[PDB]
Amino acid sequence: PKVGRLIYTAGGYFRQSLSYLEAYNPSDGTWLRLADLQVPRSGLAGCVVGGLLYAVGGRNNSPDGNTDSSALDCYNPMTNQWSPCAPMSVPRNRIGVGVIDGHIYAVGGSHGCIHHNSVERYEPERDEWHLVAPMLTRRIGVGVAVLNRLLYAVGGFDGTNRLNSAECYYPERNEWRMITAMNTIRSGAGVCVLHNCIYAAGGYDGQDQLNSVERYDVETETWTFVAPMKHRRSALGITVHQGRIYVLGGYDGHTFLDSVECYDPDTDTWSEVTRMTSGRSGVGVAVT
């Protein structure tokens, strides 16, 4: 059943880090502006747990300085209010996040020149972070998705090398394992899950911004290309709404995009469905 869920986009970057929170309704094509983040943020990740939107990590980059963020803030759509939560152990710009069993996992990212392999877990009921097992690889500009209580960390930059590698976290055992590498090197890709596949859309391969899209089928253990996006983009937002993938904004090597594209796996096609109210990259996105 279609019940009126919306795509939320928080923060982002255009000329400086942004404070915007806006919601898109794919049913009628409208955008609604909501309460601003208290502190501007770009390079953050968004997620939803128990009806609440969380904005995790990122950075505030502007003429008033460049500072990485360890912040966790939570937005309640029912009250249109933001609330601070406990901060992470370390700042994490260009972080990846995923949710397992009602907990938020914060993965990788950077603090100054430090490229984290560390991972930590937030428990909303206790408003507490706890360190878990680190990744095998340091990854900033990493993408994360969860399928059947396993968490995948995909691509990124380790401080020296830009990565086509990916790895999987097994939460009950608290361990990481490398999986099949992607066909393409990608930092700053959009990573999500749809059906039995983990998608990696766009990103930066060290030369160009990418419009290619590939997916890892967790059963057959292959990465296969699907149809490419209309626009090359890195530092895009990505999410899934009613069985389709949406990509929001990003940087194409020239412009900070307002384009939103939508992927239908049944026809293997992308279409432009709307424009954001202003172009931006480095947003956190989620659906509730």
Q: How far apart (Å, rounded) are the C-alpha atoms in residues 183 and 214? A: 8
Q: How far apart (Å, rounded) are the C-alpha atoms in residues 216 and 28? A: 32
130, 152 contact by CB (below 8 A) = no
Distances from the Cα of 238 to the Cα of 7, 160, 250, 262, angstroms: 10, 26, 10, 10
Distances from the Cα of 232 to the Cα of 65, 225, 251, angstroms: 29, 15, 8
Taken in order 14, 162, 252, 265, the sign of the CA dihedral is: negative
Q: How far apart (Å, rounded) are the C-alpha atoms in residues 180 and 165? A: 7
* Count of beta carbons in the 10 Å neighbourhood of residue 218: 17
Token pair for 5: 């869920």
Q: How far apart (Å, rounded) are the C-alpha atoms in residues 223 and 287? A: 26
Residue reference for tokens 């933001």: 82
**Torsion angle defined by CA atoms of residues 12, 165, 113 and 129, in that order, rounded to the nearest 10 degrees:** 70
- In 3D space, the residue among 47, 51, 41 whose CA is nearest the CA of residue 13 turns out to be 41
Q: How far apart (Å, rounded) are the C-alpha atoms in residues 105 and 93? A: 15
* Secondary structure in 3-state letters for the chain: CCCCCCEEEECCECCCECCCEEEEECCCCEEEECCCCCCCCECCEEEEECCEEEEECCEEEECCEEEECCCEEEEECCCCEEEECCCCCCCCECCEEEEECCEEEEECCEECCEECCCEEEEECCCCEEEECCCCCCCCECCEEEEECCEEEEECCECCCCECCCEEEEECCCCEEEECCCCCCCCECCEEEEECCEEEEECCECCCCECCCEEEEECCCCEEEECCCCCCCCECCEEEEECCEEEEECCECCCCECCEEEEEECCCCEEEEEEECCCCCECCEEEEC
Q: Which amino acid is at 247?
A: V
Resolution, given in Å to one decimal, reads 1.9
Longest dimension (CA), the chain: 49
Taken in order 223, 192, 275, 20, the sign of the CA dihedral is: negative
* Count of beta carbons in the 10 Å neighbourhood of residue 79: 9
DSSP lists the bridge partners of residue 154 as 143, 166
Q: How far apart (Å, rounded) are the C-alpha atoms in residues 228 and 199? A: 12
Dihedral pair phi/psi, residue 232, rounded to 5°? -60, 140
Taken in order 227, 229, 233, 234, the sign of the CA dihedral is: negative
Ramachandran area for residue 265 (φ above 0: left; ψ -120 to 50: alpha; else beta): alpha
Tally of structural domains, the chain: 1
| CA 167 and chain centroid, separation | 16
Token pair for 235: 């530092």
Q: How far apart (Å, rounded) are the C-alpha atoms in residues 240 and 225? A: 18
- In 3D space, the residue among 60, 93, 51, 107 whose CA is nearest the CA of residue 288 turns out to be 51
Distances from the Cα of 15 to the Cα of 103, 117, 249, 264, angstroms: 33, 29, 14, 33
Q: Which amino acid is at 30?
A: T
Distance, first Cα to last Cα, the chain:
14
**Those residues with Cβ within 8 angstroms of residue 134's Cβ, 6 or more apart along the chain or in another chain:** 117, 118, 119, 176
CATH number of the domain residue 209 falls in: 2.120.10.80
57, 10 contact by CB (below 8 A) = no
User: What is the residue range of 184's domain?
Assistant: 1-288
Residue reference for tokens 């361990």: 175
User: Structure solved using which method?
Assistant: X-ray
